[PDB]
Enzyme design. Structure first.
Site: not given
Ligand code: NAG
Ligand code: MG
Lengths: 51, 249, 702, 48, 215
Positions: C471, C518, C641
Site C-alpha cells: 500500500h 499487499d 500501517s
C-alpha cells in the site's frame, strides 16, 4: 485525639497494630479495638501498655 | 470501663492541702479516663494519703491495668510509677523467662475429633514432631509448672534428635493446670510446631502453647473395649502409614 | 468429590489440573487474581481455604490491576511526585541536597512486570571507610554508622517477603558482606532472558567469558532433583533435556568435571557417584541419565538427601588437592515443604568440613556454590531463600512460571554461543537501548505527490531483501520516494530493484478498496555486516525455522501451519511506535472456527455499501485479529500501517504476516470499538511467489 | 461503602523531619525594571 | 560569615553549614580558607582546608556527629590562610531532647522598676499552640534576684495560677522583696536586677514547657 469542628459529635474507632518485638494484649488472631466519643472542639486521651 | 464518683471527688477537693482543677468538674462521668491532683506538700516522716471509689459502667473482656505516677514540678526525670489490677498480683503482665530474654504468654492453652481430621492436619508443612509419651513425674512451682515425660517411640522425628528411653521436659503456665487434667502414669500422643522450642543445645524444652495438641491414649489391654478401639486402630493405621508410606505431599 | 461448580473467575478463565484435584485461574496481561492463584482439593472433599499473606478470605474470584511498590524512606533527597499508589507506566524523579553526589538513575518507571526499570538511586557524601549501601525501594534500613566493623539491617513492609541478606557487615577491605535485599510479592515471575543472563554471569568470569581455575584444580557438580507428587509426568521427562544441555554447555569450555546424580522422594537414591572412575566423561553420564525410572507408592525428606550428599563428599588424612577444589550444587526443587527436619544444619556442617567460616584473615569464600530453581505457583519463597548462598553482585535463587520455561532457558543458553548466522535471536544486556530490543524494524518516509508525509515500517528478511506493505509503495515511486533506515542510523543506501505482486490491484462495485496481495519487496546489491543492534527476522517453513522450534526435521509445512496457527486464540504482538519510541503491544489472533465470526462484522467498514459477496474483497487469505474477543484489546492503526506481525514462542520471534488495515479509525483518537477488527495478509498463501523468487540467496528454503 | 469503614485500607503519615529544602536556586529571568521573577514548586511534609 | 541550618542537635544526626566570603567593599571574592571544629574542652577534633574559586563565594560543608559523644557546647572556627591572626567563630549545642508542642511568653508592663511604687511588679503570661489555636492549663511562677555573677532565689514568692485562653497575671509586692534580702534601706538595691521563671502544664498531663525572662 484532637477534634476541631464547631458543631459536631464524633464516635470513632481506635486500633493499635501488633508487633512481634513488643508484648501487649493484641495477638495475631485478635487485636485491640476501642470505641470512643469526642466532644466538639476538644481532645481525648487513650493510654496503652507495652513491654 | 471504670470511672470515678463525682461526689467523692467533690468532697476530696473541698478539703485543704489538695487542689483539683475547675475544668475537671464539668467533665461528666462518661469521659474521665485520666485524673490529675496537685499536692501542696508531702511529709518526710509519716504516710499521709487518701482513697476513693470506682464504678463500672461497661463490660469489657481482658481489662488493661491502671497506672499511678507521682513527681515534683521542677525535676521531671525523678518520678515514681506503679500499677494495679484486681485479679492480677502487682499488675505486672505475664511472661516466663530466666534473666536474659523471653517471649510472653498472653494466649490460650490448647485448640479444643474424627479419623480424617487427624489424618489430614498432622501433615501440615509447619508441624515438626509427632511423639507418644508416658508421663513419669509432675512438679508445680510459682512461675510455671513442669512435667517430665518418657518417650516410647519416635513416630515422626524433627530437628531435635531423640532416642527411645530418653526423658523430656514440658513447661506450662499455671492457668492451663485445670485445662490439661494430667495425672500420674498415663499415656498420651502429641504433636506441635517448631516455634515452641526454648532454651538451647542441649537443654531444649517444649512449650504447651495454643497450637500443640495432646490426646489421651488408653492402655493396650483396653483397645478390645469400644471406648477408644476405633481410635486405637485409627492411630495404629496412621502410625504404620507414616512409617511404611509417609504422607502424600 | 470436591464441589467443582461455581468456581468461575470474573474477567478471566480457569482450568482444572491433575484430574480435578487442582484448579488454576488466569487473566490477561496486566492483571493478577486475588488473593490466590491455584487451589487444591483435599481428601475430605472440601476446597482448601484461601491462604493469603495473612489469611484474608474472599467470597468471589476476581483479578485486579498490577500495582508497583511505593517508596518507603529516602535519606538526604527528595523525589517527585507522590501518590498513594502508582499505576503502570508512571515516572518518578529523584534529586538530592547540595554538597552531595547522586549515583544510579534519576528517572525511574515501572512496567507490566512489576519492577522499576534501572538501578537504585543513592546520594552519598564521601566521608566513611566503606560507602553508603542505600535504601532499596520498598524496604527500611536500621543503622547509621559507616566505619569499620559496624552492621546494617533491613526489613520491608506488610504483605511482602524478603529475598537477600538480613544483616550486612563492613569488611576489612571496604566492601559489605552479603547481597542487597529487595523483597518480592507473590505474582512476580522471572522471564528466561534474565535467568540465563544471571546464571551465565555468576557461573563464569569475563576477560570473552572463560572459567577460571587454579593449577591442579577441579570442579564437582552435584545435581539434586525431587520426585515427590508435584508433577507426576512419566519418568522425569523434560528434566533430561535440561540436564543434557547443561552438561554440553559446561563441557564446551574445555574443563573436566566430575558429576554425581541423586534422587529423593522419601529415601535418597544415588545413580552415578563421584568416586566411580567412569564418571568423568559426558557420554557415559548421559547414557546413565537416559535410563531414570519412576518408583513411588510420596513424602519429602530433604535432610536425608543432603546428608547423603555430605557422605558422598566426605573423606576417610585428606588427599592431595583438597585445598584447590570447587563444589557446585544445583537443586531443582519445586517444593521444599520439609517433613522430617530442617536442612540448614546440614549445610552448616558441610561448610564446616571445608574450613570456610573459621578464619578472619583467610575467609576462603568462593569454594562452594549452591543454586536453587523453583517451579510453579506453590513455591515457598521464605524457605527457598534461606537455603541458597548469598554473595554480592550475583543472584543465586531463581523462580520460574512452569516446566516449559526450564527447557526454554537452557535452549537459549545453548543457542547464545552461536554465531550471528541464526534467525531471530534477542540478547538484551543490563544497559541496553531501544533498538537493541528490536534489531529488525526499519522505517521508510515518503512524500507522495499531492499529499503530506507517509511513514511506513518493514522487516529485514535478509541482507539483500526488505519487505514492506505494498500500500505504501506504488509502481510510479522513483528514487526520491525510496529512502531506507537500517542499522539504527539515518544513513541512506543505494538500491537495485523493487518487486510487486503481479496480482496486486486496487480497482463500479461500490468498493473502491482492493487490498489483495499487499506485498512489496526491495532488492539491493549491498552486503550488510551483522552486528549488535541490527539483526534479521526468521520466516516460516524453512530449515532454520524447523531448527528454531526444537522439532525433528520430519515436520511438514502443513504441520507447522497447524502448530503455529491452531484453531484457537493465539497470542501475538505488534511493535507499535509511540512517543518517538518503539514498544510492543499484545493481541489475540483467531484462526479457528471464530474466524468467520470475526469476519461477520466486516460490513461496518466505511465504503462497504455495495458488498455483493462478503468475501469478494475480503479474500480468504485475510486473517482477522483483535477486538473485544474475549477482552477489550486495542487494535492497530491506519496511519501507522506497514509493520510486520510477529508471534513469540520458544523464546523466538517468527514472522506471520503484514498488517493491511482495520475496520474503523479510532487510533487517531489516541490523544476501542467492539467492531474494530484488524485484517492482515497471511504469508503462507504467498509462499509460491517467494519460493520462485528466493532461489539465489540460499537460505535453506524448503 | 456497603461496609462501615474498618482499619484495613488507610495509609499513614510517616515523614517527620526537622529541616528540609537545603537547595540552591539561580535567577535568569529577563529583567523588568531590574526585578527578575522566578516561580518554584514545593511539596509539603507530613507534620502539623 | 558562617550559617548553620539548626541550633540544637542530637547524637547520630548530621550538621550542615555554609560559609560566605566577602571583601572590604562587600563583594564576592575567591581565596583559601581553613576550618576547625572544637569540642567543649578546646582541643580540635577535625580540621580542613578549602578553596572557593569559581563558585561566586558560597561554600557548603557537612559533618556527622557520632553515636557515643560528649555533650554541651561545640565551636566552629574559620580563618583565611594568608593571615592566621584573625579568626571567626560560631557556636552550637549538642544535647538529647524531644520536640515541644506550644510556646510560652512572659512579659512585664514596664521594663524598669521604680522603687517607690506600692503595686510592686506585675507580669502577664501568654501561651499558644504552634498552629495558632489557644491553650488551657496551669502555671507555676517564681521570682529571683540577679547580681554580678550571682543568683538568689526567694522561696516565699512562688505562685500557682490557672491559665485560660492563654492569659495569666502575677503580682509581686514590696514586702516580699524587702524581706527576702537583708537590706532595709531601699536605696542600696539600685544596681541589682530581677528575673522571673514560669512553668506551664496542660490539663491532659502530656507536656511541660519552661520560659525565663532575665534582666
Ligand atoms: C592446602 O594444603 C595445606 C593444608 O593442609 C596447606 O599447607 C597448603 O598451603 C594449602 N594449599 C594452598 C593454600 O594452595
Ligand atoms: Mg512435595
Amino acid at each position: 485525639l484532637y477534634n476541631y469542628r464547631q458543631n459536631q459529635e464524633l464516635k470513632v474507632r481506635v486500633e493499635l497494630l501488633h508487633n512481634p518485638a513488643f508484648c501487649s494484649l493484641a495477638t495475631t488472631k485478635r487485636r485491640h479495638q476501642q470505641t470512643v466519643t469526642i466532644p466538639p472542639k476538644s481532645s481525648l486521651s487513650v493510654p496503652y501498655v507495652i513491654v | 470501663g471504670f470511672a470515678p464518683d463525682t461526689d467523692d471527688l467533690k468532697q476530696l477537693a473541698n478539703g485543704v492541702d489538695r487542689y483539683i482543677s475547675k475544668y475537671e468538674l464539668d467533665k461528666a462521668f462518661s469521659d474521665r479516663n485520666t485524673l490529675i491532683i496537685y499536692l501542696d506538700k508531702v511529709s518526710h516522716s509519716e504516710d499521709d494519703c487518701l482513697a476513693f471509689k470506682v464504678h463500672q459502667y461497661f463490660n469489657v473482656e481482658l481489662i488493661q491495668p491502671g497506672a499511678v505516677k507521682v513527681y515534683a514540678y521542677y525535676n521531671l526525670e525523678e518520678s515514681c510509677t506503679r500499677f494495679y489490677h484486681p485479679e492480677k498480683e502487682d499488675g505486672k503482665l505475664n511472661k516466663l523467662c530466666r534473666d536474659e530474654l523471653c517471649r510472653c504468654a498472653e494466649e490460650n492453652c490448647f485448640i479444643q475429633v474424627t479419623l480424617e481430621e487427624r489424618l489430614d492436619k498432622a501433615c501440615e508443612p509447619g508441624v515438626d514432631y509427632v511423639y507418644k509419651t508416658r508421663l513419669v513425674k509432675v512438679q508445680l512451682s510459682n512461675d510455671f509448672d513442669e512435667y517430665i515425660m518418657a518417650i516410647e517411640q519416635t513416630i515422626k522425628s524433627g530437628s531435635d534428635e531423640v532416642q527411645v528411653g530418653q526423658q523430656r521436659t514440658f513447661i506450662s503456665p499455671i492457668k492451663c493446670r485445670e485445662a490439661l487434667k494430667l495425672e500420674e502414669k498415663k499415656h498420651y500422643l502429641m504433636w506441635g510446631l517448631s516455634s515452641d522450642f526454648w532454651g538451647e543445645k542441649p537443654n531444649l524444652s517444649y512449650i504447651i502453647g495454643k497450637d500443640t495438641w495432646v490426646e489421651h491414649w488408653p492402655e493396650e489391654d483396653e483397645c478390645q473395649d469400644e471406648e477408644n478401639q476405633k481410635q486405637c486402630q485409627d492411630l495404629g493405621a496412621f502410625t504404620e502409614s507414616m512409617v511404611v508410606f509417609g504422607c502424600p505431599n | 468429590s470436591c464441589s467443582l461448580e461455581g468456581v468461575e473467575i470474573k474477567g478471566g478463565s480457569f482450568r482444572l489440573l491433575q484430574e480435578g484435584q487442582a484448579l488454576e485461574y488466569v487473566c490477561p496481561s496486566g492483571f493478577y487474581p486475588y488473593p490466590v492463584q491455584t487451589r487444591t482439593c483435599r481428601s475430605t472433599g472440601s476446597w482448601s481455604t484461601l491462604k493469603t499473606q495473612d489469611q484474608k478470605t474472599v467470597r468471589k474470584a476476581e483479578c485486579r490491576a498490577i500495582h508497583c511498590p511505593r517508596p518507603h524512606d529516602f535519606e538526604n533527597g527528595e523525589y517527585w511526585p507522590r501518590s498513594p499508589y502508582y499505576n503502570v507506566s508512571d515516572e518518578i524523579s529523584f534529586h538530592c541536597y547540595d554538597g552531595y553526589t547522586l549515583r544510579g538513575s534519576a528517572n525511574r518507571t515501572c512496567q507490566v512486570n512489576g519492577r522499576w526499570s534501572g538501578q537504585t538511586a543513592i546520594c552519598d557524601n564521601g566521608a566513611g571507610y566503606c560507602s553508603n549501601p542505600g535504601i532499596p525501594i520498598g524496604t527500611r534500613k536500621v543503622g547509621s554508622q559507616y566505619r569499620l566493623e559496624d552492621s546494617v539491617t533491613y526489613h520491608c513492609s506488610r504483605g511482602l517477603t524478603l529475598r537477600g541478606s538480613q544483616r550486612r557487615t563492613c569488611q576489612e577491605g571496604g566492601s559489605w558482606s552479603g547481597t542487597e535485599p529487595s523483597c518480592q510479592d507473590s505474582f512476580m515471575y522471572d522471564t528466561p532472558q534474565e535467568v540465563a543472563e544471571a546464571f551465565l554471569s555468576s557461573l563464569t568470569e569475563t576477560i570473552k567469558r572463560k572459567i577460571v581455575l587454579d593449577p591442579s584444580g577441579s570442579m564437582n557438580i552435584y545435581l539434586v532433583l525431587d520426585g515427590s507428587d508435584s508433577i507426576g509426568a512419566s519418568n522425569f521427562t523434560g528434566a533430561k533435556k535440561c540436564l543434557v544441555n547443561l552438561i554440553e554447555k559446561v563441557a564446551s569450555y574445555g574443563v573436566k568435571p566430575r558429576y554425581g546424580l541423586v534422587t529423593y522422594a522419601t529415601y535418597p537414591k544415588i545413580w552415578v557417584k563421584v568416586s566411580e572412575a567412569d564418571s568423568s566423561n559426558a557420554d557415559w553420564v548421559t547414557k546413565q541419565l537416559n535410563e531414570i525410572n519412576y518408583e513411588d507408592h510420596s513424602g519429602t525428606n530433604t535432610k536425608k538427601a543432603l546428608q547423603a550428599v555430605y557422605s558422598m563428599m566426605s573423606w576417610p588424612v585428606p588427599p592431595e588437592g583438597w585445598n584447590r577444589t570447587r563444589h557446585v550444587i544445583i537443586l531443582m526443587t519445586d517444593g521444599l515443604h520439609n517433613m522430617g527436619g530442617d536442612p540448614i544444619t546440614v549445610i552448616d556442617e558441610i561448610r564446616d568440613l571445608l574450613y570456610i567460616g573459621k578464619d578472619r584473615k583467610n575467609p576462603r569464600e568462593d569454594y562452594l556454590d549452591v543454586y536453587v530453581f523453583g517451579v510453579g505457583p506453590l513455591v515457598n519463597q521464605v524457605n527457598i531463600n534461606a537455603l541458597a548462598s548469598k554473595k554480592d553482585n550475583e543472584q543465586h535463587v531463581f523462580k520460574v512460571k512452569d516446566m516449559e520455561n526450564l527447557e526454554d532457558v537452557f535452549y537459549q543458553m545453548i543457542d547464545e554461543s552461536q554465531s550471528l548466522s541464526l534467525c531471530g535471536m534477542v540478547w538484551e544486556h543490563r544497559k541496553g537501548t531501544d533498538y537493541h530490543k528490536q534489531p529488525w524494524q526499519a522505517k521508510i518516509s515518503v512524500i507522495r505527490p499531492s499529499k503530506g508525509h507517509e511513514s511506513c515500517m518493514g522487516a529485514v528478511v535478509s541482507e539483500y531483501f526488505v519487505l514492506t506493505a505494498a500500500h505504501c509503495f506504488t509502481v510510479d515511486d522513483k528514487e526520491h520516494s525510496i529512502k531506507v533506515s537500517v542499522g539504527g542510523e539515518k544513513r541512506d543506501l543505494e538500491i537495485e530493484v523493487v518487486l510487486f505482486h503481479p496480482n496486486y490491484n486496487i480497482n463500479e462495485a461500490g468498493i473502491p478498496e482492493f487490498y489483495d496481495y499487499d506485498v512489496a519487496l526491495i532488492k539491493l546489491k549491498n552486503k550488510l555486516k551483522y552486528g549488535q543492534t541490527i539483526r534479521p527476522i526468521c520466516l516460516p517453513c524453512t530449515e532454520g525455522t524447523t531448527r528454531a522450534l526444537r522439532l525433528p526435521p520430519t515436520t511438514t509445512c502443513q504441520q507447522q501451519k497447524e502448530e503455529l496457527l491452531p484453531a484457537q486464540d493465539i497470542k501475538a504482538l505488534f511493535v507499535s511506535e509511540e512517543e518517538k519510541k518503539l514498544t510492543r503491544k499484545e493481541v489475540y489472533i483467531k484462526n479457528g472456527d471464530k474466524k468467520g465470526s470475526c469476519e461477520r462484522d466486516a460490513q461496518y467498514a466505511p465504503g462497504y455499501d455495495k458488498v455483493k459477496d462478503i468475501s469478494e474483497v475480503v479474500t480468504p487469505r485475510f486473517l482477522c485479529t483483535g477486538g473485544v474477543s474475549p477482552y477489550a484489546d486495542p487494535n492497530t492503526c491506519r496511519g501507522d500501517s506497514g509493520g510486520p506481525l510477529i508471534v513469540h514462542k520458544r523464546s523466538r520471534f517468527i514472522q506471520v504476516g503484514v498488517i493491511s488495515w482495520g475496520v474503523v479509525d479510532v487510533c487517531k483518537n489516541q490523544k476501542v470499538p467492539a467492531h474494530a477488527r484488524d485484517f492482515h495478509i497471511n504469508l503462507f498463501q504467498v509462499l509460491p511467489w517467494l519460493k520462485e523468487k528466493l532461489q539465489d540467496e540460499d537460505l535453506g528454503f524448503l | 461503602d456497603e461496609d462501615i469503614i474498618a482499619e484495613e485500607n488507610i495509609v499513614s503519615r510517616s515523614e517527620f523531619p526537622e529541616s528540609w529544602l537545603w537547595n540552591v536556586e539561580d535567577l535568569k529571568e529577563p529583567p523588568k525594571n531590574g526585578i527578575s521573577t522566578k516561580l518554584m514548586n514545593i511539596f509539603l511534609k507530613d507534620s502539623i | 560569615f558562617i550559617q548553620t541550618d539548626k541550633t540544637i542537635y542530637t547524637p547520630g544526626s548530621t550538621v550542615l553549614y555554609r560559609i560566605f566570603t566577602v571583601n572590604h567593599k562587600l563583594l564576592p571574592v575567591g581565596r583559601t580558607v581553613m576550618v576547625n571544629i572544637e569540642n567543649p574542652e578546646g582541643i580540635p577534633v577535625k580540621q580542613d582546608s578549602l578553596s572557593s574559586q569559581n563558585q561566586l563565594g558560597v561554600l557548603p560543608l557537612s559533618w556527622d556527629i557520632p553515636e557515643l559523644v560528649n555533650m554541651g557546647q561545640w565551636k566552629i572556627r574559620a580563618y583565611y590562610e594568608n593571615s592566621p591572626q584573625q579568626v571567626f567563630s560560631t557556636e552550637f549545642e549538642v544535647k538529647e531532647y524531644v520536640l515541644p508542642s506550644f510556646e510560652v511568653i512572659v512579659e512585664p508592663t514596664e521594663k524598669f522598676y521604680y522603687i517607690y511604687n506600692e503595686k510592686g511588679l506585675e507580669v502577664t503570661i501568654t501561651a499558644r499552640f504552634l498552629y495558632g489555636k489557644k491553650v488551657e492549663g496551669t502555671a507555676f511562677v517564681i521570682f529571683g534576684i540577679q547580681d554580678g555573677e550571682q543568683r538568689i532565689s526567694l522561696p516565699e514568692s512562688l505562685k500557682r495560677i490557672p491559665i485560660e485562653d492563654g492569659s495569666g497575671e502575677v503580682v509581686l509586692s514590696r514586702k516580699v522583696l524587702l524581706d527576702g534580702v537583708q537590706n532595709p534601706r531601699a536605696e542600696d538595691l539600685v544596681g541589682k536586677s530581677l528575673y522571673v521563671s514560669a512553668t506551664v502544664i496542660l490539663h491532659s498531663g502530656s507536656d511541660m514547657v519552661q520560659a525565663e525572662r532575665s534582666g
